[PDB]
């Protein structure tokens, strides 16, 4: 019954892609939707059975790689952590499949889109249900391949291809980091299986020689794994791919980049917690990177005008929050916020796509307004999603973000203070741009054109059922799962997550701090909402400062253009490497220098030597 969970999306993809000519645009949708939905219900029984029944299942099919001791078999591991990711990934995938039935109603190549979605779901399931470090790597790179394929689903566009290739390059650096980490894991424990590594993760206390440096064996492995996590989760080091990856279809944004494949890094950190717990040096790096990513995305997302791009920076900020929540060695809260966000961010993307599709694919907030009366349902749904995202009290986003912030406060260390400060300011910024997105799209006086308003149609049934289900989730699931995941002394996780007794600060997070700290996110959210209203709905529009102050214009350009990452990084790395490819390696090393000392550059003097033999 558990192999069916993983292989139903694979069979659906293999049918809809190999025999889509016989099923058409409707049969290919039915196959994939039915297969993923059956996998989702099977994941529901898996949750009732493993997570709630407290009986994990371990399933090994056949050995994959069998060297002397490099054994990485075809093993599947379903524990409490895996099942949560299953019920998130597969449920969101089924809802996205149902959404795309009506979204891809006029696009010609709908069957290939659904085949790609099913193969992506299959790769994500192989990622989450991975017993080894290699099956995990198999899914970790198949998910990148599927995202690349889906980003340029419209191959005729040029921006889509550029975004897809940039995403592949960034994910390739991440994969290099992950591969180095996996190589480090095998050199220590002589195994790649999770059970043996997590069982023997405490004994080794030796030092290695890595790249002319003497480092700690466990710390180096943890840092190398975190490099891969940064690559996939779009953290401070490698994140420029995610905002550019919005050139794909909206359902691609809602599943490929909102709920899944950005939480892959967080899931890998949480799963490898019995190993990250013994390298305190790596936790500092994780905390710093998460705080930096959250603040940077929050600052970048406040001046964007594209509807889809604003939400991408919200996703980046939420992933940063999860990352430095893992950095405080509290993985239960990280997974809780992951599951919470996978609801009210998928809802946000789906509602934004519903607005865009009805607006003749208009993506600029400067050219929409007064849509609240025209789009009642979608306005309500985006209101629910935004209120959950900002962390409105007694809502799905309130039971996780507030806990993360108060936990960061009570981590009385140098790294914890930095994360607390950045996560506190990011709440204000998140409230500001979330409410700006809500205000400009729906409540400001109309700025659109006559043709867009004339051709308006709200979401039909296939695009409304997933929305309503996600709204119910974003209303109640956080409260329902608050007790089992971030409760005191809960045994829901069982052995999935390990938190050492020394670094356990969950109890003090609740009653050790002033009540003001527990109300800082709400006050900052209210301040951000007030600022957004006062700058958008009613204002003299002092933008003349942006037309008279040179610094203000450059400051506006700094936040708008992703902190000048794409421009600077391109010129100083990509262009430099492109020159390094031709102007030296091809132009001088192997062009004529070998030739001139080779067989014909100067060795053709035999013509000037053999002809002289007549003497």
């Amino acid at each position: 019954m558990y192999l069916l969970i993983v292989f139903l999306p694979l069979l659906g993809s293999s049918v809809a892609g190999f025999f889509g000519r016989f099923l058409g645009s409707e049969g290919s949708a039915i196959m994939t939707t039915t297969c993923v939905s059956f996998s989702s219900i099977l994941s529901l029984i898996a949750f009732y059975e493993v997570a709630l029944g407290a009986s994990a299942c371990y399933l090994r099919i056949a050995p994959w790689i069998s060297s002397e001791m490099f054994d990485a078999s075809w093993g599947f591991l379903f524990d409490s952590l895996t099942v949560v990711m299953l019920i998130v990934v597969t449920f969101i995938s089924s809802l996205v499949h149902l959404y795309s039935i009506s979204y891809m109603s006029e696009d010609p190549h709908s069957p290939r889109f659904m085949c790609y979605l099913s193969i992506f779901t299959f790769f994500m399931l192989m990622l989450v249900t991975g017993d080894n470090f290699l099956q995990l790597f198999l899914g970790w790179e198949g998910v990148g391949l599927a995202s690349y394929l889906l980003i340029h689903f419209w191959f005729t566009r040029l921006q889509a291809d550029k975004a897809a290739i940039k995403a592949m390059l960034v994910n390739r650096v991440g994969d290099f980091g992950l591969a180095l980490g996996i190589l480090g894991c095998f050199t220590l424990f002589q195994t790649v299986d999770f059970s043996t590594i997590f069982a023997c993760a405490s004994v080794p206390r030796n030092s290695w020689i890595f790249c002319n440096m003497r480092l700690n064996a466990i710390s180096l492995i943890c840092i190398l794994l975190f490099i891969g996590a940064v690559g996939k989760s779009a953290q401070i080091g490698l994140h420029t791919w995610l905002p550019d990856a919005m050139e794909g279809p909206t359902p691609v944004s809602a599943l490929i980049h909102a709920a899944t494949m950005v939480t892959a890094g967080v899931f890998m950190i949480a799963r490898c917690s019995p190993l990250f717990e013994y390298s305190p040096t790596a936790l500092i790096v994780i905390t710093f990177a998460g705080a930096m990513t959250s603040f940077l995305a929050a600052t970048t997302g406040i001046l964007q005008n594209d509807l889809k791009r604003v939400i991408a920076y919200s996703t980046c900020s939420q992933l940063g929050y999860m990352i430095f929540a893992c950095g405080i060695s509290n993985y239960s809260v990280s997974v809780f916020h992951l599951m919470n966000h996978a609801f009210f961010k998928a809802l946000l993307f789906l509602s934004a796509g519903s607005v865009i599709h009805a607006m003749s694919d208009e993506q600029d907030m400067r050219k929409m307004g007064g849509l609240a009366s025209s789009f009642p349902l979608t306005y309500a749904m985006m209101l629910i999603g935004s209120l959950s995202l900002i962390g409105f009290p007694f809502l799905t986003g309130f039971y996780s973000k507030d806990v993360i912030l108060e936990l960061a406060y009570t981590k009385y260390t140098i790294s914890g203070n930095f994360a607390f400060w950045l996560g506190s300011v990011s709440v204000l910024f998140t409230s500001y741009y979330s409410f700006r997105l809500l205000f400009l799209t729906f409540l400001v006086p109309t700025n659109s054109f006559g043709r867009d308003i004339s051709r308006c149609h709200d979401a039909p049934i296939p695009m409304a059922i997933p929305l309503i289900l996600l709204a119910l989730g974003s209303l109640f699931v956080g409260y329902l799962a608050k007790d089992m995941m971030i409760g005191l002394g809960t045994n829901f996780w069982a052995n999935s997550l390990l938190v050492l007794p020394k670094n356990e600060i969950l109890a003090e997070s609740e009653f050790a701090a002033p009540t003001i700290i527990k109300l800082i996110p709400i006050l900052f959210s209210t301040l951000g909402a007030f600022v957004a209203y006062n700058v958008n709905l009613v204002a003299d529009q002092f933008q003349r400062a942006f037309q008279t102050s040179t610094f203000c214009n450059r400051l506006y350009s700094f936040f708008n253009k992703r902190w000048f990452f794409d421009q600077v990084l391109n010129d100083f790395l990509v262009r430099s490497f492109l020159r390094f490819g031709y102007e030296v390696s091809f132009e001088a090393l192997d062009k004529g220098a070998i030739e001139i000392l080779g067989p014909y550059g100067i060795s053709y003097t035999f013509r000037r030597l053999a002809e002289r033999i007549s003497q």
């Binding site: 069979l11 892609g17 000519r21 099923l23 058409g24 645009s25 059975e49 009986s55």
Partner: protein
């Protein structure tokens, strides 16, 4: 266009809609169901549950490896 109707693709092409996609759809389900039976039978055989469930779970109807690995000292 005019030439894309002369190109054979496995996926079906742009705006593909065969006259008998209803019958083909029904066959595809039955084929998927037939290939899913051995996978389910295989899964119920190679799966291991070291821990007895708190409450009677549906997997006890077919799976039989419940509380078998408790003697891990004699594992191969």
């Amino acid at each position: 266009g005019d030439f894309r109707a002369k190109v054979w693709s496995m996926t079906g092409g742009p705006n593909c809609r065969p006259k008998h996609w209803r019958r083909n759809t029904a066959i595809a389900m039955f084929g998927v169901f037939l290939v899913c039976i051995p996978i389910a039978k295989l899964s119920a055989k190679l799966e291991q549950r070291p821990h007895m469930p708190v409450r009677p779970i549906p997997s006890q109807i077919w799976c039989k490896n419940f509380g078998t690995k408790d003697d891990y000292e004699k594992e191969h």
